[PDB]
Amino acid sequence: QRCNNNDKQALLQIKTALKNPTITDSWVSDDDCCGWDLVECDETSNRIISLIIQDDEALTGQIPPQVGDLPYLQALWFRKLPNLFGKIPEEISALKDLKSLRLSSTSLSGPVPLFFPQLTKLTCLDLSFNKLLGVIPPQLSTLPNLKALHLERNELTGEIPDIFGNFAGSPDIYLSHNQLTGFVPKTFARADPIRLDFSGNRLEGDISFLFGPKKRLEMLDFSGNVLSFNFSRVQEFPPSLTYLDLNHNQISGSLSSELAKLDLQTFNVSDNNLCGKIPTGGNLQRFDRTAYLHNSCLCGAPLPECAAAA
Ligand SMILES: *[C@@H]1O[C@H](CO)[C@@H](O)[C@H](O)[C@H]1NC(C)=O
Ligand SMILES: *[C@@H]1O[C@H](CO)[C@@H](O)[C@H](O)[C@H]1NC(C)=O
């Protein structure tokens, strides 16, 4: 045939372990498993290289450990399974060929496991919208080929490890809606990511070293933190910045007039300690007043005109 018998028996184990959910109805010992839904075989090796279990509210239990028994997996997705619980099983460490691991929108908990650096082909690592706990493993920073890391919407505490600025190739990082504390590491000055989303944490201090004219940054969201620095020290911006959200921080100083050279699509500095005139140009008078409310003394279009004598 085509379907490898060992890949076949592992899939039949996983089906059994999940209590024959409906989404595995295609998994019949009649038909070649390469034919089945949710899975993909390689063209040459004919091994299972893909398993996508998604969007099934009734599916109850843990990640079956027999996922470790599909040794040629390149993509393993468990997404939008609210009744999936327990911890990420240690067995995923034997999946040396994964490029895409997405375990997200589930009730997976415990610590972020420590074996991910060993998964050297990883390009996408998405553990987002779970109940993961404790600190970020700094050694994740050693993966050589990551494009994106999603740890957003868990229950992670502690600081951003210094070495998280040193990912080879500067992948996008999403840490938002956790309980992270301390400063953004200055190692991020040397990183060139396209997107960063650290919003809804308890981060403090400065991020001025994230901006600057040779960076390829397009999207920055640090809204809902306690950032406390003088925005006047950012006098040049990454030219392709189109999304900048800093609402709900303790940022002070004033808006550089260099902001008017950006094609900003999204812009929000509401609920800060900013002062002085909103500069004229670019898209700045195109944002409605809600991008600028709850500041100390910003004035001008679209806020009311500057009134020094009142
Ligand atoms: C903030 O930084 C700039 C230059 O880096 C300085 O000129 C300015 O007065 C400082 N602002 C405040 C409010 O301390
Ligand atoms: C800015 O943020 C506030 C708070 O999240 C929100 O209510 C408001 O609509 C936002 N405005 C813009 C223009 O993004």
Tab-separated table of C-alpha atoms and ligand atoms in Angstrom:
chain	number	residue	atom	x	y	z
A	1	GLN	CA	0.000	0.000	0.000
A	2	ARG	CA	1.508	3.283	1.269
A	3	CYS	CA	0.372	3.664	4.946
A	4	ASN	CA	3.180	2.430	7.311
A	5	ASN	CA	1.743	-0.121	9.871
A	6	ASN	CA	3.543	1.521	12.870
A	7	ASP	CA	2.100	4.996	11.984
A	8	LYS	CA	-1.307	3.224	11.570
A	9	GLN	CA	-1.265	1.543	15.049
A	10	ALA	CA	-0.139	4.796	16.742
A	11	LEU	CA	-3.107	6.690	15.217
A	12	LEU	CA	-5.497	3.865	16.295
A	13	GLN	CA	-3.966	4.159	19.853
A	14	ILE	CA	-4.551	7.967	19.887
A	15	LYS	CA	-8.195	7.483	18.648
A	16	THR	CA	-8.834	4.916	21.471
A	17	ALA	CA	-7.126	7.136	24.101
A	18	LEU	CA	-9.400	10.140	23.092
A	19	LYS	CA	-12.539	7.807	23.403
A	20	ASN	CA	-13.291	7.622	19.593
A	21	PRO	CA	-14.254	11.298	19.152
A	22	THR	CA	-16.374	12.108	16.061
A	23	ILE	CA	-13.513	14.031	14.285
A	24	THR	CA	-11.646	10.618	13.994
A	25	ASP	CA	-14.642	8.929	12.285
A	26	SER	CA	-12.541	8.829	9.060
A	27	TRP	CA	-9.935	6.664	10.951
A	28	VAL	CA	-11.258	3.258	9.713
A	29	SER	CA	-8.994	0.160	9.393
A	30	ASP	CA	-10.744	-0.267	5.937
A	31	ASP	CA	-8.933	2.651	4.177
A	32	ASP	CA	-5.146	3.579	3.915
A	33	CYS	CA	-4.378	6.046	6.746
A	34	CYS	CA	-2.783	8.407	4.158
A	35	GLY	CA	-6.437	8.830	2.979
A	36	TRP	CA	-7.735	9.682	6.487
A	37	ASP	CA	-8.749	13.218	7.523
A	38	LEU	CA	-6.536	15.268	9.929
A	39	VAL	CA	-3.234	13.618	8.711
A	40	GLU	CA	-0.726	13.954	5.783
A	41	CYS	CA	1.898	11.407	4.511
A	42	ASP	CA	5.287	12.465	2.891
A	43	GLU	CA	5.294	11.933	-0.938
A	44	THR	CA	8.534	9.824	-0.903
A	45	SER	CA	8.780	8.246	2.649
A	46	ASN	CA	4.928	7.631	2.898
A	47	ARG	CA	5.172	8.307	6.725
A	48	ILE	CA	2.621	10.380	8.736
A	49	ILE	CA	4.071	13.938	8.771
A	50	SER	CA	0.968	15.821	9.979
A	51	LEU	CA	-1.729	15.525	12.706
A	52	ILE	CA	-4.170	18.486	13.204
A	53	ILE	CA	-6.784	17.858	15.966
A	54	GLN	CA	-8.983	21.045	16.161
A	55	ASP	CA	-12.381	22.675	17.013
A	56	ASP	CA	-14.116	19.939	19.105
A	57	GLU	CA	-15.723	21.056	22.385
A	58	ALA	CA	-16.746	17.543	23.553
A	59	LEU	CA	-13.152	16.028	23.255
A	60	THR	CA	-12.175	15.354	26.953
A	61	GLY	CA	-8.780	14.063	28.325
A	62	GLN	CA	-4.979	14.606	27.999
A	63	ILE	CA	-2.741	14.699	24.924
A	64	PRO	CA	-2.272	10.929	24.290
A	65	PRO	CA	1.421	10.051	24.694
A	66	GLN	CA	1.322	7.944	21.485
A	67	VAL	CA	1.744	11.234	19.489
A	68	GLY	CA	5.449	10.556	20.385
A	69	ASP	CA	5.105	7.374	18.295
A	70	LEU	CA	4.700	9.262	14.957
A	71	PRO	CA	8.460	9.885	14.561
A	72	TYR	CA	8.250	11.712	11.176
A	73	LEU	CA	5.671	14.350	12.367
A	74	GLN	CA	6.474	17.834	10.996
A	75	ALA	CA	3.270	19.540	12.206
A	76	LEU	CA	1.336	18.663	15.378
A	77	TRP	CA	-1.760	20.835	16.130
A	78	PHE	CA	-4.138	20.483	19.134
A	79	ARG	CA	-6.202	23.742	18.964
A	80	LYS	CA	-9.601	24.855	20.367
A	81	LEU	CA	-10.129	21.795	22.628
A	82	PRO	CA	-11.405	23.258	25.927
A	83	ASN	CA	-11.749	19.807	27.671
A	84	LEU	CA	-8.127	18.896	26.856
A	85	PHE	CA	-6.292	19.088	30.177
A	86	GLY	CA	-3.110	17.888	31.966
A	87	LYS	CA	0.406	18.929	30.964
A	88	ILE	CA	2.295	18.907	27.657
A	89	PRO	CA	3.525	15.285	27.565
A	90	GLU	CA	7.344	14.659	27.751
A	91	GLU	CA	6.848	12.231	24.746
A	92	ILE	CA	6.721	15.229	22.286
A	93	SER	CA	10.579	15.470	22.906
A	94	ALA	CA	11.050	12.421	20.521
A	95	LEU	CA	9.478	14.370	17.606
A	96	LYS	CA	12.858	15.666	16.266
A	97	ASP	CA	11.330	16.651	12.841
A	98	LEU	CA	8.551	19.082	14.093
A	99	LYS	CA	8.538	22.476	12.263
A	100	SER	CA	5.082	23.537	13.625
A	101	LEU	CA	3.859	22.703	17.142
A	102	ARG	CA	0.519	24.427	17.986
A	103	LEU	CA	-1.095	23.476	21.314
A	104	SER	CA	-3.474	26.293	21.954
A	105	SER	CA	-6.930	27.288	23.241
A	106	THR	CA	-7.007	24.267	25.614
A	107	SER	CA	-6.872	23.632	29.395
A	108	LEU	CA	-3.235	22.335	29.226
A	109	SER	CA	-1.432	23.472	32.408
A	110	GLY	CA	1.764	22.934	34.398
A	111	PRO	CA	5.218	24.443	33.622
A	112	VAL	CA	6.300	25.093	30.062
A	113	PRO	CA	8.401	21.969	29.431
A	114	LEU	CA	12.199	22.376	29.129
A	115	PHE	CA	12.792	20.055	26.083
A	116	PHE	CA	11.744	22.514	23.279
A	117	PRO	CA	15.346	23.664	22.408
A	118	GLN	CA	16.008	20.022	21.366
A	119	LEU	CA	13.222	20.425	18.673
A	120	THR	CA	15.744	22.136	16.385
A	121	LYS	CA	13.583	22.332	13.201
A	122	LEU	CA	10.901	24.418	14.978
A	123	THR	CA	9.680	27.409	12.884
A	124	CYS	CA	6.327	27.937	14.731
A	125	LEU	CA	5.900	27.232	18.497
A	126	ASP	CA	2.365	28.207	19.664
A	127	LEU	CA	1.420	27.339	23.291
A	128	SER	CA	-1.035	30.290	23.474
A	129	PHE	CA	-4.436	30.517	25.292
A	130	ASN	CA	-3.759	27.653	27.745
A	131	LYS	CA	-3.238	27.674	31.574
A	132	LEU	CA	0.595	27.228	31.483
A	133	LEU	CA	2.398	28.349	34.663
A	134	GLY	CA	5.767	29.488	36.061
A	135	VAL	CA	8.627	31.261	34.311
A	136	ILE	CA	9.617	31.339	30.590
A	137	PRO	CA	12.454	28.821	29.903
A	138	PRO	CA	15.365	31.026	28.794
A	139	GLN	CA	16.964	28.181	26.697
A	140	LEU	CA	14.125	28.553	24.153
A	141	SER	CA	16.351	31.436	22.912
A	142	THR	CA	18.717	28.761	21.423
A	143	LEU	CA	16.280	27.494	18.737
A	144	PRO	CA	17.990	28.463	15.452
A	145	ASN	CA	15.007	28.669	12.913
A	146	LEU	CA	11.963	29.993	14.848
A	147	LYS	CA	9.803	32.565	12.936
A	148	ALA	CA	7.245	33.097	15.722
A	149	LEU	CA	6.851	32.296	19.452
A	150	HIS	CA	3.329	32.553	20.970
A	151	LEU	CA	3.179	32.201	24.786
A	152	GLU	CA	0.298	34.729	25.075
A	153	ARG	CA	-2.763	34.198	27.375
A	154	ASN	CA	-1.366	31.691	29.892
A	155	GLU	CA	-0.507	32.278	33.606
A	156	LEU	CA	3.298	32.841	33.248
A	157	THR	CA	5.070	34.861	35.985
A	158	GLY	CA	8.616	36.190	36.536
A	159	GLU	CA	10.749	38.240	34.124
A	160	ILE	CA	11.640	38.063	30.419
A	161	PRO	CA	14.990	36.246	30.428
A	162	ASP	CA	17.892	38.471	29.324
A	163	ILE	CA	18.735	35.927	26.556
A	164	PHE	CA	15.222	36.183	24.950
A	165	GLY	CA	16.811	39.099	22.979
A	166	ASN	CA	19.237	36.631	21.283
A	167	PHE	CA	16.993	34.319	19.236
A	168	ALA	CA	18.873	33.771	15.866
A	169	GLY	CA	16.795	35.455	13.108
A	170	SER	CA	14.683	37.610	15.496
A	171	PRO	CA	11.302	35.798	15.425
A	172	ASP	CA	8.058	37.550	16.357
A	173	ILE	CA	7.274	37.147	20.067
A	174	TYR	CA	3.829	37.197	21.701
A	175	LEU	CA	3.889	37.165	25.558
A	176	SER	CA	0.723	39.290	26.080
A	177	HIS	CA	-1.933	38.665	28.805
A	178	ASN	CA	0.375	36.823	31.317
A	179	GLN	CA	1.677	38.244	34.713
A	180	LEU	CA	5.312	39.042	33.634
A	181	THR	CA	7.193	41.634	35.738
A	182	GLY	CA	10.494	43.613	35.511
A	183	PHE	CA	12.019	45.342	32.454
A	184	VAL	CA	12.248	44.472	28.752
A	185	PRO	CA	15.870	43.222	28.457
A	186	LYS	CA	18.260	45.683	26.643
A	187	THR	CA	19.464	42.679	24.551
A	188	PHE	CA	16.221	43.472	22.547
A	189	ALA	CA	18.085	46.584	21.168
A	190	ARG	CA	20.133	44.140	18.971
A	191	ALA	CA	17.063	42.007	17.968
A	192	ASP	CA	15.222	42.954	14.708
A	193	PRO	CA	11.728	41.386	15.062
A	194	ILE	CA	8.792	42.282	12.789
A	195	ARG	CA	6.160	41.971	15.585
A	196	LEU	CA	6.222	42.187	19.387
A	197	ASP	CA	3.115	41.910	21.595
A	198	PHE	CA	3.930	42.138	25.356
A	199	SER	CA	0.620	43.840	26.232
A	200	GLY	CA	-1.405	43.152	29.437
A	201	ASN	CA	1.564	42.216	31.651
A	202	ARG	CA	3.048	44.144	34.604
A	203	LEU	CA	6.222	45.315	32.694
A	204	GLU	CA	8.073	48.430	33.879
A	205	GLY	CA	10.738	50.869	32.683
A	206	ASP	CA	11.842	51.748	29.175
A	207	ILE	CA	11.406	50.356	25.620
A	208	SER	CA	13.000	53.263	23.665
A	209	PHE	CA	15.764	50.861	22.382
A	210	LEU	CA	13.097	48.897	20.415
A	211	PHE	CA	12.618	51.810	17.926
A	212	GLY	CA	15.234	53.349	15.699
A	213	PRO	CA	15.579	53.819	11.977
A	214	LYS	CA	17.237	50.575	10.700
A	215	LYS	CA	14.781	48.192	12.508
A	216	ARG	CA	12.169	46.191	10.436
A	217	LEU	CA	9.499	46.423	13.201
A	218	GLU	CA	5.921	46.689	11.770
A	219	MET	CA	3.830	45.928	14.895
A	220	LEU	CA	4.366	46.834	18.555
A	221	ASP	CA	1.726	46.336	21.316
A	222	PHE	CA	2.880	47.131	24.893
A	223	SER	CA	-0.568	48.378	26.008
A	224	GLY	CA	-1.667	47.605	29.597
A	225	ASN	CA	1.703	47.496	31.369
A	226	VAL	CA	3.416	49.972	33.792
A	227	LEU	CA	6.074	51.277	31.294
A	228	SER	CA	7.630	54.362	32.792
A	229	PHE	CA	9.988	56.254	30.465
A	230	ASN	CA	10.187	59.618	28.674
A	231	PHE	CA	8.827	59.177	25.132
A	232	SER	CA	10.844	62.265	24.004
A	233	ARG	CA	13.997	59.996	23.863
A	234	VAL	CA	12.472	58.199	20.847
A	235	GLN	CA	13.300	60.755	18.093
A	236	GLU	CA	13.508	58.236	15.150
A	237	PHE	CA	11.185	55.262	14.325
A	238	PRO	CA	11.363	52.016	12.272
A	239	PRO	CA	10.099	53.279	8.903
A	240	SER	CA	7.618	50.370	8.291
A	241	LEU	CA	5.923	50.761	11.746
A	242	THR	CA	2.136	50.601	11.009
A	243	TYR	CA	0.809	49.392	14.400
A	244	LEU	CA	1.830	51.069	17.667
A	245	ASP	CA	-0.276	50.558	20.823
A	246	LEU	CA	1.032	51.907	24.163
A	247	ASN	CA	-2.308	52.751	25.788
A	248	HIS	CA	-2.520	52.212	29.613
A	249	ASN	CA	1.144	52.793	30.703
A	250	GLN	CA	2.858	55.572	32.797
A	251	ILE	CA	4.750	56.952	29.770
A	252	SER	CA	5.695	60.663	30.020
A	253	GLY	CA	7.163	63.359	27.702
A	254	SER	CA	5.852	64.277	24.290
A	255	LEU	CA	5.155	62.825	20.825
A	256	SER	CA	8.111	63.200	18.397
A	257	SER	CA	7.107	64.985	15.186
A	258	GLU	CA	8.833	61.983	13.430
A	259	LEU	CA	5.556	60.053	14.193
A	260	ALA	CA	3.946	62.024	11.260
A	261	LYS	CA	6.240	60.298	8.668
A	262	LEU	CA	4.833	56.808	9.564
A	263	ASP	CA	1.913	55.239	7.624
A	264	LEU	CA	0.336	54.357	11.009
A	265	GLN	CA	-2.884	52.234	10.591
A	266	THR	CA	-3.198	51.623	14.371
A	267	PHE	CA	-2.040	54.142	16.988
A	268	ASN	CA	-3.068	54.532	20.619
A	269	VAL	CA	-1.308	56.383	23.456
A	270	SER	CA	-4.462	56.934	25.637
A	271	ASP	CA	-4.088	56.587	29.500
A	272	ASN	CA	-0.464	57.773	29.849
A	273	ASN	CA	1.330	60.860	31.302
A	274	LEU	CA	2.113	62.532	27.876
A	275	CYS	CA	2.281	66.330	27.552
A	276	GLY	CA	2.445	69.023	24.836
A	277	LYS	CA	1.214	69.447	21.300
A	278	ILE	CA	0.123	66.436	19.167
A	279	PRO	CA	2.237	67.118	16.022
A	280	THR	CA	0.502	67.761	12.624
A	281	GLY	CA	1.046	65.409	9.604
A	282	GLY	CA	0.794	61.761	8.514
A	283	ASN	CA	-2.196	59.973	10.000
A	284	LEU	CA	-2.025	61.753	13.417
A	285	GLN	CA	-5.121	64.024	12.935
A	286	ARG	CA	-6.778	60.975	11.274
A	287	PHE	CA	-7.012	59.094	14.620
A	288	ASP	CA	-10.067	60.129	16.672
A	289	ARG	CA	-9.563	61.689	20.130
A	290	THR	CA	-9.791	58.222	21.872
A	291	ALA	CA	-6.148	57.495	20.744
A	292	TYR	CA	-4.984	60.437	23.009
A	293	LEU	CA	-7.487	60.805	25.991
A	294	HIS	CA	-6.448	60.420	29.650
A	295	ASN	CA	-3.009	62.080	29.208
A	296	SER	CA	-1.491	64.875	31.481
A	297	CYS	CA	-1.549	67.754	28.978
A	298	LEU	CA	-1.639	66.637	25.348
A	299	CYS	CA	-3.572	69.250	23.274
A	300	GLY	CA	-4.290	69.955	19.555
A	301	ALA	CA	-6.292	68.211	16.767
A	302	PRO	CA	-7.961	65.897	17.379
A	303	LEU	CA	-7.985	67.020	21.077
A	304	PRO	CA	-8.954	70.682	21.803
A	305	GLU	CA	-6.444	73.456	20.699
A	306	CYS	CA	-3.444	74.120	23.057
A	307	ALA	CA	-4.505	76.612	25.865
A	308	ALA	CA	-1.339	77.697	27.785
A	309	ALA	CA	-3.241	80.386	29.879
A	310	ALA	CA	-5.840	77.867	31.282
B	1	LIG	C1	13.202	63.533	27.851
B	1	LIG	O1	14.296	63.195	26.926
B	1	LIG	C2	14.709	64.292	26.020
B	1	LIG	C3	15.992	63.968	25.169
B	1	LIG	O2	16.450	62.570	25.153
B	1	LIG	C4	14.815	65.632	26.823
B	1	LIG	O3	15.247	66.639	25.867
B	1	LIG	C5	13.517	65.985	27.650
B	1	LIG	O4	13.375	67.270	28.389
B	1	LIG	C6	13.177	64.849	28.641
B	1	LIG	N1	11.795	65.016	29.149
B	1	LIG	C7	11.303	64.968	30.418
B	1	LIG	C8	9.815	65.245	30.629
B	1	LIG	O5	12.019	64.726	31.392
B	2	LIG	C1	-7.497	53.279	22.369
B	2	LIG	O1	-7.579	52.486	23.532
B	2	LIG	C2	-8.813	52.592	24.297
B	2	LIG	C3	-8.582	51.671	25.475
B	2	LIG	O2	-8.388	50.300	25.011
B	2	LIG	C4	-10.075	52.246	23.519
B	2	LIG	O3	-11.321	52.352	24.279
B	2	LIG	C5	-10.020	53.188	22.341
B	2	LIG	O4	-10.982	52.950	21.343
B	2	LIG	C6	-8.739	53.040	21.536
B	2	LIG	N1	-8.755	54.034	20.487
B	2	LIG	C7	-8.187	53.836	19.335
B	2	LIG	C8	-8.410	54.868	18.298
B	2	LIG	O5	-7.523	52.880	19.046
